[PDB]
Amino acid sequence: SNLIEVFVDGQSVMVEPGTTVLQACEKVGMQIPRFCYHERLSVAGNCRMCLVEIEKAPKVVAACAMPVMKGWNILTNSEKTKKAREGVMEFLLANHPLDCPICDQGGECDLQDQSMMFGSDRSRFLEGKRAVEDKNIGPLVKTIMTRCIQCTRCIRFASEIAGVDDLGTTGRGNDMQVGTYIEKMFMSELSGNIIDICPVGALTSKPYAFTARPWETRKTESIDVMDAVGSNIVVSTRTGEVMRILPRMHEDINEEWISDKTR
Amino acid sequence: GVRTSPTGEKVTHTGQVYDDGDYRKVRFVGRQKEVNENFAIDLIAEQPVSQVGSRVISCDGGGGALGHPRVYINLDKETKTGTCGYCGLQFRQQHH
Amino acid sequence: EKLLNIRPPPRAQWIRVLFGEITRLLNHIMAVTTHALDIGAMTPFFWMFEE
Amino acid sequence: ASATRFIQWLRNWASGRDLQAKLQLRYQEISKRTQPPPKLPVGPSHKLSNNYYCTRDGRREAMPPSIVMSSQEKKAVSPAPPIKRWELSQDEPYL
Amino acid sequence: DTRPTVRPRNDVAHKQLSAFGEYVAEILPKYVQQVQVSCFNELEICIHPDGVIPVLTFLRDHSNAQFKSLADLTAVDIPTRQNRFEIVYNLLSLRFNSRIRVKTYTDELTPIESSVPVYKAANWYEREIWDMFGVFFANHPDLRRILTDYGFEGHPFRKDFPLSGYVELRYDDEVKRVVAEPVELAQEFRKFDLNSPWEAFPAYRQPPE
Amino acid sequence: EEMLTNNRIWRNRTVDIGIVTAEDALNYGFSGVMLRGSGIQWDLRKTQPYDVYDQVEFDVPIGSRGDCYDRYLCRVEEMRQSIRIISQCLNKMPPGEIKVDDAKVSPPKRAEMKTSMESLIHHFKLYTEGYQVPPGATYTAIEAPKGEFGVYLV
Amino acid sequence: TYKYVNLREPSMDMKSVTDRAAQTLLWTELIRGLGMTLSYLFREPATINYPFEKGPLSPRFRGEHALRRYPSGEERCIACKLCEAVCPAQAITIEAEPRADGSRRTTRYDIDMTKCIYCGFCQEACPVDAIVEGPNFEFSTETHEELLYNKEKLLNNGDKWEAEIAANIQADYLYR
Amino acid sequence: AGLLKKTTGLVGLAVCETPHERLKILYTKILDVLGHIPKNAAYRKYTEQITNEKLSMVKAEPDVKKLEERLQGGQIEEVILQAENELSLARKMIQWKPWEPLVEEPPASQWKWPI
Amino acid sequence: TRDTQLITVDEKLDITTITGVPEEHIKTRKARIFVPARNNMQSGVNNTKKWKMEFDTRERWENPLMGWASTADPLSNLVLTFSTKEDAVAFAEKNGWSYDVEERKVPKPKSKSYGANFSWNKRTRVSTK
Amino acid sequence: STSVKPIFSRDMNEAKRRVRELYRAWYREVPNTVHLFQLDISVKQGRDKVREMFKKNAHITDPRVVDLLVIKGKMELEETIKVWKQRTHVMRFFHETEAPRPKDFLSKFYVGHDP
Ligand code: SF4
Ligand code: SF4
Numbered sequence A: 001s002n003l004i005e006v007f008v009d010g011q012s013v014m015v016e017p018g019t020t021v022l023q024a025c026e027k028v029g030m031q032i033p034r035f036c037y038h039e040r041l042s043v044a045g046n047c048r049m050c051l052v053e054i055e056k057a058p059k060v061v062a063a064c065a066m067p068v069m070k071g072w073n074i075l076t077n078s079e080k081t082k083k084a085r086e087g088v089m090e091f092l093l094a095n096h097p098l099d100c101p102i103c104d105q106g107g108e109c110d111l112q113d114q115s116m117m118f119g120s121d122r123s124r125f126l127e128g129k130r131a132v133e134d135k136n137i138g139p140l141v142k143t144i145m146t147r148c149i150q151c152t153r154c155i156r157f158a159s160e161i162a163g164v165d166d167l168g169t170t171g172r173g174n175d176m177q178v179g180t181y182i183e184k185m186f187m188s189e190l191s192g193n194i195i196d197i198c199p200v201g202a203l204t205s206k207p208y209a210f211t212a213r214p215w216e217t218r219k220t221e222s223i224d225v226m227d228a229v230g231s232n233i234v235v236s237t238r239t240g241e242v243m244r245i246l247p248r249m250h251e252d253i254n255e256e257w258i259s260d261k262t263r
Numbered sequence B: 001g002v003r004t005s006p007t008g009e010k011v012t013h014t015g016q017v018y019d020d021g022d023y024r025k026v027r028f029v030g031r032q033k034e035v036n037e038n039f040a041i042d043l044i045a046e047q048p049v050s051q052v053g054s055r056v057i058s059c060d061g062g063g064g065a066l067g068h069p070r071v072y073i074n075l076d077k078e079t080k081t082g083t084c085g086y087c088g089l090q091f092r093q094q095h096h
Numbered sequence C: 001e002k003l004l005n006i007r008p009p010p011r012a013q014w015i016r017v018l019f020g021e022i023t024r025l026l027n028h029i030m031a032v033t034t035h036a037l038d039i040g041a042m043t044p045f046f047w048m049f050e051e
Numbered sequence D: 001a002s003a004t005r006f007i008q009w010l011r012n013w014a015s016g017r018d019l020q021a022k023l024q025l026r027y028q029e030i031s032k033r034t035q036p037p038p039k040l041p042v043g044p045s046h047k048l049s050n051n052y053y054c055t056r057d058g059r060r061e062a063m064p065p066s067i068v069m070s071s072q073e074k075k076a077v078s079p080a081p082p083i084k085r086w087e088l089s090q091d092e093p094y095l
Numbered sequence E: 001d002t003r004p005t006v007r008p009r010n011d012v013a014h015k016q017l018s019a020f021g022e023y024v025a026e027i028l029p030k031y032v033q034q035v036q037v038s039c040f041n042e043l044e045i046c047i048h049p050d051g052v053i054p055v056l057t058f059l060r061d062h063s064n065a066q067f068k069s070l071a072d073l074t075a076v077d078i079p080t081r082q083n084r085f086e087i088v089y090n091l092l093s094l095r096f097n098s099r100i101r102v103k104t105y106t107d108e109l110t111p112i113e114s115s116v117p118v119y120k121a122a123n124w125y126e127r128e129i130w131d132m133f134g135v136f137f138a139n140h141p142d143l144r145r146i147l148t149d150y151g152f153e154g155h156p157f158r159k160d161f162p163l164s165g166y167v168e169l170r171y172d173d174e175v176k177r178v179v180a181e182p183v184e185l186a187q188e189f190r191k192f193d194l195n196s197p198w199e200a201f202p203a204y205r206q207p208p209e
Numbered sequence F: 001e002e003m004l005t006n007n008r009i010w011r012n013r014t015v016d017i018g019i020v021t022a023e024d025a026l027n028y029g030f031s032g033v034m035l036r037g038s039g040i041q042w043d044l045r046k047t048q049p050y051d052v053y054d055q056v057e058f059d060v061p062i063g064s065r066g067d068c069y070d071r072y073l074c075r076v077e078e079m080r081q082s083i084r085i086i087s088q089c090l091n092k093m094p095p096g097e098i099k100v101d102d103a104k105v106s107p108p109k110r111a112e113m114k115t116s117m118e119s120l121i122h123h124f125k126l127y128t129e130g131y132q133v134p135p136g137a138t139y140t141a142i143e144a145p146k147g148e149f150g151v152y153l154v
Numbered sequence G: 001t002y003k004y005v006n007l008r009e010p011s012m013d014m015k016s017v018t019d020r021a022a023q024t025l026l027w028t029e030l031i032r033g034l035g036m037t038l039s040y041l042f043r044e045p046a047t048i049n050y051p052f053e054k055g056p057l058s059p060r061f062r063g064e065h066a067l068r069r070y071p072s073g074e075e076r077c078i079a080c081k082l083c084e085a086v087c088p089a090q091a092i093t094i095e096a097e098p099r100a101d102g103s104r105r106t107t108r109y110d111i112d113m114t115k116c117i118y119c120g121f122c123q124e125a126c127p128v129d130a131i132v133e134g135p136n137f138e139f140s141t142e143t144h145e146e147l148l149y150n151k152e153k154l155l156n157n158g159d160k161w162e163a164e165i166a167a168n169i170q171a172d173y174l175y176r
Numbered sequence H: 001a002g003l004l005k006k007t008t009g010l011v012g013l014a015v016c017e018t019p020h021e022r023l024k025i026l027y028t029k030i031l032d033v034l035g036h037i038p039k040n041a042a043y044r045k046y047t048e049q050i051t052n053e054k055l056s057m058v059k060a061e062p063d064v065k066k067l068e069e070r071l072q073g074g075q076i077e078e079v080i081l082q083a084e085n086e087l088s089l090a091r092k093m094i095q096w097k098p099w100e101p102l103v104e105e106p107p108a109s110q111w112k113w114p115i
Numbered sequence I: 001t002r003d004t005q006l007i008t009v010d011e012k013l014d015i016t017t018i019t020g021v022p023e024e025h026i027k028t029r030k031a032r033i034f035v036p037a038r039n040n041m042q043s044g045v046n047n048t049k050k051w052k053m054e055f056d057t058r059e060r061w062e063n064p065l066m067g068w069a070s071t072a073d074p075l076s077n078l079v080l081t082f083s084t085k086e087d088a089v090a091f092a093e094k095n096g097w098s099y100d101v102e103e104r105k106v107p108k109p110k111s112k113s114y115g116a117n118f119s120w121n122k123r124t125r126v127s128t129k
Numbered sequence J: 001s002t003s004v005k006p007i008f009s010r011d012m013n014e015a016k017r018r019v020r021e022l023y024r025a026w027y028r029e030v031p032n033t034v035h036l037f038q039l040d041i042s043v044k045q046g047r048d049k050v051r052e053m054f055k056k057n058a059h060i061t062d063p064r065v066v067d068l069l070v071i072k073g074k075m076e077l078e079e080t081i082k083v084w085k086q087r088t089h090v091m092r093f094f095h096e097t098e099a100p101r102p103k104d105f106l107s108k109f110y111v112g113h114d115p
């Protein structure tokens, strides 16, 4: 066939042309770190957390946006790859606020877990952090944008999945802020999903605010009945009480999204 | 402060009070219901709003390592005060 | 620590040996004096349990 | 420590040792209950440079067991050299 | 090897134990199924359960083994396997100042040969395995429950046994006796999901699917 | 010892009582003073040392008759050897930190957890999820005050 | 290195044999034991006059729990639930919601003082020093229900023992 | 041989008055049992190797104290006791025949960890 | 070969009578064999690699004293991990439980091109970056 | 696939010999159990309880499962004979302090959600 051969840490794998370095590592069970890449949105390549060394190449490549060339040996655990993940994680946490105890994302946060799996264990940052002013985008999504890492997943989702071009980046540089610029409400039938695709606690559920923590919930896999689509959901419960509703991936029904009524 | 429902049972700071028909009130017969009278919501509101001449101010809660993690608060918004998410202290920008 | 593949720092190792041997005196005082108490001798229990 | 010299002699004589030198009751020789604040040192990883975690990561240097034999001329060997014989204490060989 | 926070690696012992592992396998090919040495220099001999007595007797009596002390005997319950149980022997050699692990397996219904003839220490350890796991040991002097209550039903250390059991005790005044009734908890044990969804150790990754 | 060691009443209750032979002690899984009371020269603090026990000097008491009396002498003598070790620990105590300088295993100082983003993440995760231990099984044993105390951790 | 504890041979010279004969007949070594206990009779007893004299403790003592406040009077707890997650005995139960002013605060904070093992992990895990184990060790009760503390009991403990808790922390926070 | 030790130091282990004679008997007896083991069995080759090495030292060290150091097996009575344990094992190894191929391979994932 | 003098037993493995479990918890239960779904709040996929066996949820009520969540179900916290679906089904049938099996859901491979973000004549051109 | 090591019995005929032997041992021991433990039940009640316990496991057809039941049952008899059990343990077979749970659908429907 047209399949080309690439190596992931020396293991051969046959991938279709156009496949990305990140997708080639999935074929062998390896998951590359990521904050901006989502398998159902456009490729951004702006978090630089997926940098992976390619053998016999002096430069690291964005694994989420780099197509695989034939005969490449992707080194997912070399010193260069691991030193690229520590630097990027160090830059993500430089201005991030010490909000973990009061942040609803604590315990199920990709920034926490990838900081403890791919980053360093301390900080050499001896300055003052940045502070951003919060924004109101409706009664459903609570915004604390000091925690935003400018991953643009909410921008791509709102424009592509929801077909609403209301979110964007204003300013430039370290002062780049995600928002609607003007006082506007991102009220859409798929508006609640920006909570999930936000890796940090910048976007969180307002009804669910402060009620529970991820580890103490019990997950019941059920079906949504608010409409005839039959969206698959997870009913999170704690001590005999329903706490929140979450999407459950089903490729042929609802992807990994659910409408606001369901959520 | 501490309120009292019509039955005379003191309402806690969490809004808890047994209804008239609730049998669980019997546990207080011959004893007392322990209610803390120093409502935090009331006390924190008594603190004055501090004026600071900068866009961004930081709060560690007072005492350094005896306080809370140091967070940074934005004061650009002129229609409200900036509030610390740990201790509740409020800050404002000097004449903007 | 063997499974983690880490090593405790030298000062911690000495404290653990220090209190490991203070803990040995706690055990042997209990063992010897309660052994004597069962056999009948009762006063050594009181002298060494103040230590 | 308040015992009279007569009783001190009597208790010393009966036990056969100078008890007053090693009293089992503590007096002002103990440390003060209030002590000055400490300033604890930092570990060897409290550096600002040449301190990447991939160079000091113990957990990531653990490997799965090395399989010697699997079912999927030579000299006899013991698990280790025979244990060396112990030597009698030079401090107090016989109690 | 100068790194303060990383455990030093002893490669001399790793070599010696690997050589003795082959030594055992060459002498007992009839039972030895697998041999391995961990990164912390511990040797494991995996055997067919029919070789419990031959393998242990060799290690106890052989001149170059002299494993004359049974440090411990225990079982591990892994429900995913056909032989869910895994009988583990830890032996200590005072002559050669070394330790070895012998591992076998059995299911709920297959007996395992008793080790009492080799090690008298195994008398009480095998009662514990039967008591807490339900593994029967053949030719045991007196096989009984050793840790659970009299008339206790079930083997607690099985993974499918609930943490709080099925019965609880209280004193009933009507019958002037201590009675057993189905378990009810004023506060249920809260189950936490703590596993991170991000792989921690690439070196131990399994082949896909 | 003035009350027990040379007391004839005490010696009657202990001498030639509970004799265990050296070969039976090993085959029954005995350890510690039970082995040493029968003359077996074995102490894990000297043969398989851990921590810093190879940097301290002490003697291992050894019995000769394997009876309750000899094992009593070993315990009284070990208490003297523990004072010997403590004297060396009090003098050779070094400076430095007291937990491994690896915040992915041991929590950071509270002053660091309230100042550094990385430390707060690690304090949060260590006290909620804990640190992951790589797969494997180990049998670790020490010379506990009353024998070989071991853990088979999987 | 090792040493024999009971490997000795008694000298068989006539004087030594007679010395042992006197010991056997005249009970010499049994009178040393009498002398040893006689000396203790004249030593000052080590007994303290409780409850008027209390055994010494240290600032690190782990006693009765208390929920602390800031100098402003605001509660320190922000319902992070780290103490609930690390509690070895699962003795802590927490529920929280947005307060009327928007703050993150608990509507429930229960410690079952009969499940608690008084280990101090909860105060090691708290990021804001909200939950502490105080120096009180005299709180025995006449009923099992009085040891099931709720947020109201724990706040009163904080308002009760703050003058002492704050001083003990001051004397120990540089070791934490 | 020199002076005869008064005690072995191990409870229940009597002092042997003819150690060199007793060790020749046992080591020789071991080599006789190993003959009935198949010539290519690893137990026969290894046990014969070590047994001859021990037997060689016994026949070249008339002094007991010096012989203990060369054998490195503790007191001479411990070495005699271990020669008797090697003889019982050799007799039992004949009835077990562990040199035969593996009785049965385990299920495919019987020794996989983690589950 | 073996010399243990084996015997032939031809019948489905069943240990319900020797496990010690009460009758009411072998016949009225329903064990759900499934691969846990990804926690949508994260991107990691390491929790969706092993099969699990959880039982049906029973009643939880409110403790009249402290309001805690009380239960009378001994198997409310019982989760078993299996390497394969057939391993899970074998364990369920061995212990007599009734089981429902949910087939694994794997994300489908997707064609991701960064060059499609800037397309000459397609709707995949992005208005923002 | 079907070859397995037996515990004691090679077939059901051999396993049922042990079951009947165990029933005799229990049948003869009830009169003493009601006597030594001073149970307030009669021999008829106790011997009917033994019969009930045996009948619960009458549908078994696996000789290995039957052997475990006899082995477990023999251990129960040993504790009763030697008075390792107390009056509480013997009387735990009768559930005297448990209110009889409903069996029909309507009764279970009213009182709760369990099947
Ligand atoms: S987004 Fe994650 S790292 Fe940032 S404060 Fe929230 S939980 Fe902590
Ligand atoms: S708000 Fe969340 S999803 Fe949007 S850019 Fe920031 S981190 Fe990404």
Ligand code: SF4
Pocket (backbone or CB within 6 Å): G083, G086, G087, G088, G089, G090, G091, G092, G111, G115, G116, G117, G118, G119, G120, G121, G122, G123, G133
């Ligand atoms: S001291 Fe320990 S057991 Fe007690 S509440 Fe705190 S963490 Fe839980």
Ligand code: SF4
Pocket (backbone or CB within 6 Å): A101, G076, G077, G078, G079, G080, G081, G082, G083, G084, G094, G122, G125, G126, G127, G128, G129, G130, G131
């Ligand atoms: S750890 Fe402290 S802040 Fe967090 S819930 Fe417990 S008491 Fe509150």
Ligand code: FES
Pocket (backbone or CB within 6 Å): A033, A034, A035, A036, A037, A044, A045, A046, A047, A048, A049, A050, A051, A062, A063, A064, A065
């Ligand atoms: S995941 Fe590739 S740069 Fe963000």
Ligand SMILES: [K+]
Pocket (backbone or CB within 6 Å): A105, A194, A195, A196, A197, A198, A199, A200, A201, A202, A203, A204
């Ligand atoms: K989010």
Ligand SMILES: [Zn+2]
Pocket (backbone or CB within 6 Å): B059, B060, B061, B068, B084, B085, B086, B087, B088, B089
């Ligand atoms: Zn603050």
